[PDB]
Amino acid sequence: AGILFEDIFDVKDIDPEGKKFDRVSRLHCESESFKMDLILDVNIQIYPVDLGDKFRLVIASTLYEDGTLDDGEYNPTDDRPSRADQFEYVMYGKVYRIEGDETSTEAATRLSAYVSYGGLLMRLQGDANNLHGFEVDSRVYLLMKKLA
Amino acid sequence: GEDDAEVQQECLHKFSTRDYIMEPSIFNTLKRYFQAGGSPENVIQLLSENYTAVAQTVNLLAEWLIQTGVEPVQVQETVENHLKSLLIKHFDPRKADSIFTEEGETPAWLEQMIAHTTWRDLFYKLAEAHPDCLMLNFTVKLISDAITSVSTACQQLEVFSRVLRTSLATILDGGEENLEKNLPEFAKMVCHGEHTYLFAQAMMSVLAQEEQGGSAVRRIAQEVQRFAQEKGHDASQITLALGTAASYPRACQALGAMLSKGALNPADITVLFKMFTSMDPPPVELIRVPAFLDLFMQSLFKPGARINQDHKHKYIHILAYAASVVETWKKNKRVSINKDELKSTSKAVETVHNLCCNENASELVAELSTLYQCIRFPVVAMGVLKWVDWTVSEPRYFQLQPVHLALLDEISTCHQLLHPQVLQLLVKLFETEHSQLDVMEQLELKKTLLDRMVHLLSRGYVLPVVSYIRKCLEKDTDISLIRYFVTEVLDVIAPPYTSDFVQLFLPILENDSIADPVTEFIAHCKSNFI
Amino acid sequence: KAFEKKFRFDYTNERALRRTLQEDLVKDVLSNAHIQNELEREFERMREDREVLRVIFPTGDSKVVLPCNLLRMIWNAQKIFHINPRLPSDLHPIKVV
Amino acid sequence: QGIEQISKVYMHLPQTDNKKKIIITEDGEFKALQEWILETDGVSLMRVLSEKDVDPVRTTSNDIVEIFTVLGIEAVRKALERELYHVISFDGSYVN
Amino acid sequence: LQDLGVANGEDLKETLTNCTEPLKAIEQFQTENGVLLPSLQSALPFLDLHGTPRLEFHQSVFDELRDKLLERVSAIASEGKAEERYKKLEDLLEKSFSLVKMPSLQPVVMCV
Amino acid sequence: KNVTLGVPRLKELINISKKPKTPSLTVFLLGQSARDAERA
Amino acid sequence: ESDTGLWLHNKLGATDELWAPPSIASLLTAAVIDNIRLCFHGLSSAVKLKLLLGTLHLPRRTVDEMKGALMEIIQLASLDSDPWVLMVADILKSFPDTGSLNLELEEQNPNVQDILGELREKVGECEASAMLPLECQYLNKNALTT
Amino acid sequence: SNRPVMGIVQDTLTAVRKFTKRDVFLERGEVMNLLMFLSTWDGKVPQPAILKPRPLWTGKQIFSLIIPGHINCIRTHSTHPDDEDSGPYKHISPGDTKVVVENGELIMGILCKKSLGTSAGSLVHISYLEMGHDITRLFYSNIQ
Incomplete structure (x- = not known):
């Protein structure tokens, strides 16, 4: 294993504030099997995404589907079975913030994990139970596949 | 190994403390100490010698205060507030639910606490801190049936309805001048919940049909509904259902569409204009x-x-x-x-x-x-x-x-x-x-x-x-x-x-x-x- | 109010200490009143410092020029040692003082 | 009436916090109050400071030798520092 | 204690020893030797229902109202007439001189 | 009114001139006149 | 979808969102409307509230389409134990058929009966210099005197 | 004025403002060609920001490779709105206008005068104060 999170989302807004970049769009997406809000910057030029599209999303610690660590270095000659073959859009980033609604006396019920894939920002808000796999300054892979 | 020795040590530790004679687990602890192999004579010293009559000391202090010209009632309020704070920080809702479980009607001490206003205030604050406690819920039910936080004020109807009645009577009595200062304390609780808002607007529609100043009530609906609007809420469709909008289907369609938009559009104005220019x-x-x-x-x-x-x-x-x-x-x-x-x-x-x-x-x-x-x-x-x-x-x-x-x-x-x-x-x-x-x-x-x-x-x-x-x-x-x-x-x-x-x-x-x-x-x- | 709330250490709420500190440290803080005396003395001297700054800066300008950028060094310490701010910490307050 | 050498006095409220009246409220907060301040075109500081209903604490001058003859060498040191800071930081340029 | 007709550990000893009835005796003691105020007489069984000792309550209110003793003598130090001051101080002095032998009531006598 | 600034003012200050080009005061009021325009 | 009750709880179980969240018109398709009555009473009180109240947000046509299931669920609410559910059921019993609220709540309600008594007597007493609603400012002299 | 006197100027400043935009993506040949000009590079090609449908690196990845040591810095782009910090999207920037260099990595924001120019708290200033003059020299040369 090594899958920190998995769900299926649907897009409710492609860019609510008007596009600020001609290749990157800020998808706002909702999850139906839970209550998770997603904001995600997607390079629409190579992976066009339309409004109301459905997709499986998977946030993983590694790609080799064995738990073996990734080393964080580009190895195009890698021969190991990768999860990326099961998906269409694979980004690689680093979680840099985990907000919560915790008080000074209680634990957070709602958590908000922020990931930066080379600059392309993602927020994932939702119940804390689904976001315990996240931990700031840990490398992570966002895998994505549109569903019919 | 037997735990009777450690229980003996704990019993000796507890008995030796000052004024432990007044503790009510003393029966069980004495039983523990005597069955385990202790004596019933050392505890007499551990309690009586360590007893200094601190209660009677407090009696001397309270009567000295009364003899100094200090009114007793403020001191009574002070000690009652002390007990209140101590119970608040030592509260345990499972214990309260246990007092519920032993009998559905709580033993008669809590009714006596109801008879005194300070403990009613205590139980209000306790339910405010922890809404999940069935003892506290039954108690606030009994109090209201006999400054409730907005969560607690809406958590129960009979509470909420009575509170809405009192607040609405306050609004009408305070009139057009107190309206500004009695609105937000009222509109916050009405706009706290679609259920609360719908209920209050329904009672308001029922009352406003009265002709002896029901308009005085209907504006309070308008205040509270615009309060919902500025709080980012779906106050349109509730208002449409509260009138005769259903008799004119496309009217409610267009009106709700533009109010949800928050602005007009010539399509809706086309429908309404043709609707009204016509002699129906x-x-x-x-x-x-x-x-x-x-x-x-x-x-x-x-x-x-x-x-x-x-x-x-x-x-x-x-x-x-x-x-x-x-x-x-x-x-x-x-x-x-x-x-x-x-x-x-x-x-x-x-x-x-x-x-x-x-x-x-x-x-x-x-x-x-x-x-x-x-x-x-x-x-x-x-x-x-x-x-x-x-x-x-x-x-x-x-x-x-x-x-x-x-x-x-x-x-x-x-x-x-x-x-x-x-x-x-x-x-x-x-x-x-x-x-x-x-x-x-x-x-x-x-x-x-x-x-x-x-x-x-x-x-x-x-x-x-x-x-x-x-x-x-x-x-x-x-x-x-x-x-x-x-x-x-x-x-x-x-x-x-x-x-x-x-x-x-x-x-x-x-x-x-x-x-x-x-x-x-x-x-x-x-x-x-x- | 804000100064006391944000700067006076509170040792009278066990829940916050369990949230922020490891269990043995919380028991140590709650147990001995000597550490409590040290912490309230720290807050008292910080209030004295506050009054001194009010004398020095009557205009209320917090912008000042100083040798060591304390917030940035704290951030550097957080990242060097991978300090997870979601977990209780093992740093004794009296060690800080 | 009036004090000689003072040929024009403009009256105005400050729009910069440094000239506003910063007080400490009862809760320890800084509150900036709009107060009438008078800016002259001449200099006679001893007379104005002696004048009734003139704050003889914050009333100052931009003339250095007036501060020297009236207040003293250390007040001159401070006022000179303030004038140098003013003329340097007018254009938003900072010097240590 | 017995200077003011207050029952002490000697009274508790003579009522405990040579008594085949401890239970009504301790019960009537704890009732008639409680705190004198009607709100407490409702609240003491409830107060004690949680396993909460009456020790903690007694100690806390004793310390608080003894601090009020010290505060009120400090206030009357320079209040109104010196005659009223020294009269009340002499009265409380003669009252607590019975209790000057005690370790907890000697500071009252010393403050007076 | 605008006072001299820049290198003329800097020259006037490093020279300790017995006459600045635009000498001036900054008088502060303390009574009601600090608040009241008419008294000011 | 399976686990319609648990799914609806996950979508509406947040006890702080006392106003029904937006997109509720999207969460209440015909299939889920028919699945609600299968496990209507298995949900919590606040979930039942937000669910029943979301029906007012639906389009009028969509309100009309499933009105049999809405009426059934409103009667399931009328027979429930939670009082909020009881009053909203009593109000909504006439809503799906026409979109008209039921203002016949005076029956079987000490709260409403006390509202009637106290506040009708107050209104009859407060008929002096009665406030004039906001739309009154718009009306001309004839309409205002009317 | 306790601040740097050398900064990034003219072509390099306009070009870095263009480069660290959110929507700059580089094919592998471009990345390798640019990494040729990086004197402090350790020879390890970083993982791309996008692996599929094609390997791509962003400008911020390469600039994070330029940034020395493990410095940490917070700035605002010159077009940073005056209410973005008060809105919901505070730590996530719609315009990418909040510069956050983290652990020696630029993880968000567009660089400008107010991040690489001659001002107190600028990134070159922090690079000096942390890594020393030599590593800051190499930082300047590598940017250019």
């Missing part, structure tokens, strides 16, 4: 939703006009219909429709619309008589009021030797209902800060605004403006502006006066000794108005 209109009361009319005012009079001159007559026709067309009703039967003044109202609205959208206007001096005659229509007047608000409120408006405030003089001359509106604008302009304006110029500007306030005061709106003057005095603005204001007020007033008018005007008339109408007013009010 829905009731004019149906479309007189004040939020919708604010949509009209924010669209037809904003700087621009971002309006189509072809659709213009449709918007104006609907506005003049909603304001002017008078429907007669006889026992929930529409008798007649009076389209008399819709012509002239639409004409004047079109005129004033042309002028506020011209913006080239320097001809405003020419259109003044026309503007005054059009302002005689109240709806036209407050349309001009919102236009003047947006115009003057912009930065860098003041590069003229002014005219837009003379409009406000007319506005308050004709319609007393718009008196609260004009004041609310002027105070905002009175408190806005200007950078490009010289300091003396800002002083003369605020003098002109005070002239507008004085003209408003001449129309019988004396109490709120003088209250605001006293506020900004005691809370800021220079004493010269206040002195100039009271000079202008003393210029035109004449005797006699009213007690409230001197209750507000006189206490601001001692912080300054600078100037005879002043000494004449003093001589009058001192003798007549103590």
Whole structure:
């Protein structure tokens, strides 16, 4: 294993504030099997995404589907079975913030994990139970596949 | 290994403490100590020798306080508050649920606590801290059946309904003047929940059908529904279902669509215009939703006009219909429709619309008589009021030797209902800060605004403006502006006066000794108005 | 109010200490009143410092020029040692003082 | 009437916080109050400081030798520092 | 204690020893030797229902109201007439001189 | 009114001139005159 | 979808969102409307609240389409134990058929009966210089006197 | 004025403002060609920001490779709105206008005068104060 999170989302807004970049769009997406809000910057030029599209999303610690660590270095000659073959859009980033609604006396019920894939920002808000796999300054892979 | 030895050590540790004789687990602990292999004689020393009668000490202190002239009741409140705080920080809701489980009706001590108000307050605070406790829930139920936080106030109906009744009676008793200070404590709880909001609006619709001032209730619905609107809520469809909107399906469709939008669109105006131009209109009361009319005012009079001159007559026709067309009703039967003044109202609205959208206007001096005659229509007047608000409120408006405030003089001359509106604008302009304006110029500007306030005061709106003057005095603005204001007020007033008018005007008339109408007013009010 | 709330260490709410500190440290803080005396003395001297700054800076300008950028060094310490701010910390307050 | 050498006095409220009256409220908060300040075109500081209903604490001058003859060398040191800071930081340029 | 007719550990000893009835005796003691105020007489069984000892309550209110003793003598130090001051101080002095032998009531006598 | 600034003012200050080009005061009021324009 | 009750709880179980969240018109398709009555009573009180109240947000046509299931669920609410559910059921019993609220709540309600008594007597007492609603400012003299 | 006197100027400043935009993506040949000009590079090609449908690196990845040591810095782009910090999207920037260099990595924001120019708190200033003059020299040369 090594899958920190998995769900299926649907897009409710492609860019609510008007596009600020001609290749990157800020998808706002909702999850139906839970209550998770997603904001995600997607390079629409190579992976066009339309409004109301459905997709499986998977946030993983590694790609080799064995738990073996990734080393964080580009190895195009890698021969190991990768999860990326099961998906269409694979980004690689680093979680840099985990907000919560915790008080000074209680634990957070709602958590908000922020990931930066080379600059392309993602927020994932939702119940804390689904976001315990996240931990700031840990490398992570966002895998994505549109569903019919 | 046997735990009897460790239990013996614990029993010795507990018995040796001061005044442990009074603990009620003493029976069980003595049993533990004697069965395990202790003695029933050492505990006599561990309790009696370590007993110092600290309770009787407190009795001596309390009676000494009473003998010092200190009233007992404050000390009783103090010790009761101490017990309250100790129980609050030692609270355990599972224990309370256990007192529920041993008998559904709690043992009779809690009824005695109900009989005393301080413990009712304790149980309120406990339920506020922890809503999940069935003992606390039954208890607040019993108290209300015999300052509940808004979560706890809505958590139970019988609580909420009784609280809504008390608060609504408070609103009606405090009237149009306490309305501002009794609204938010009421609207916050009504707008706290779709269920709470729907319930309160339903009771409000039920009560407002009464004709002996049910309108007094219906505005409180309008206050609370606009409170929901500014809190970002779906207050439209509930309002549509609360009227006769279902009888006209496309009407409720279009109206809900545009209210959810928060703005108009010519498609919906096309449907409503054709609906109303036809001789089968829905009731004019149906479309007189004040939020919708604010949509009209924010669209037809904003700087621009971002309006189509072809659709213009449709918007104006609907506005003049909603304001002017008078429907007669006889026992929930529409008798007649009076389209008399819709012509002239639409004409004047079109005129004033042309002028506020011209913006080239320097001809405003020419259109003044026309503007005054059009302002005689109240709806036209407050349309001009919102236009003047947006115009003057912009930065860098003041590069003229002014005219837009003379409009406000007319506005308050004709319609007393718009008196609260004009004041609310002027105070905002009175408190806005200007950078490009010289300091003396800002002083003369605020003098002109005070002239507008004085003209408003001449129309019988004396109490709120003088209250605001006293506020900004005691809370800021220079004493010269206040002195100039009271000079202008003393210029035109004449005797006699009213007690409230001197209750507000006189206490601001001692912080300054600078100037005879002043000494004449003093001589009058001192003798007549103590 | 804000100064006391944000700067006075509170040792009278066990829940916050469990949230922020490891269990043995919380028991140590709650147990001995000597550490409590040291912490309240720290807050008292910081209030004295506050009054001194009010004398020095009557205009209330917090912007000042100083040798060591304390917030940035704290951030550097957080990242060097991978300090997870979601977990209770093992740093004794008396060690800080 | 008036004091000689003072040929023009402008009256105004400050729009910069440094000239506003910063007080400490009862809760320890800084509150900036708009107060009337008079800027002259001449200099006679001893007379103005002696004048009734003139704050003889914050009333200052932009003339250095007046501060020297009236207040002293250390007040001159401070006022000179303030004038140098003013002329340097007018254009938003910072010097240590 | 017995200077003011207050029962002490000697009274508890003579009522405990040579008594085949401890239970009504301790019960009537704990009732008639509680705190004198009607709100407490409702609250003491409830207060004690949680396993909460009456020790903690007694100690806390004793410390608080003894601090009020010290505060009130400090206040009357320079209040009104010196005659009223020294009269009340002499009265409380003679009252607590019975209790000057005790370790917890000697500071009252010393403050007076 | 605008006072001299820049290198003329800097020159005037490093020279300790017995006459600045635009000498001036900054008088602060304390009574009601601090608040009141008329008294000011 | 399976686990319609648990799914609806996950979508509406947040006890702080006392106003029904937006997109509720999207969460209440015909299939889920018919699945609600299968496990209507298995949900929590606040979930039942937000669910029943979301029906007012639906389009009028969509309100009309499933009105049999809405009426069934409203009667399931009328027979429930939670009081909020009981009053909203009593109000909504006439809503799906026409869109008209049921203002016949005076029956079987000490709260409403006390509202009637106290506040009708207050209104009959507070008939002096009665406030005039917001739309009154718009009306001309004839309409206002009416 | 306790601040740097050398900064990034003219072509390099306009080009870095263009480069660290959110929507700059580099094919592998471009990345390798640019990494030729990086004197402090450790020879390890970093993982791309996008692996599929094609390997791509962003400008911020390469600039994070330029940034020395493990410095940490917070700035605002010159077009940073005056209410973005008060809105919901505070730590996630719609315009990418909040510069956050983290652990020696630029993880968000567009660089400008107010991040690489001559001002107190600028990134070159922090690079000096942390890594010393030599590593800051190499930082300047590598940017250019």
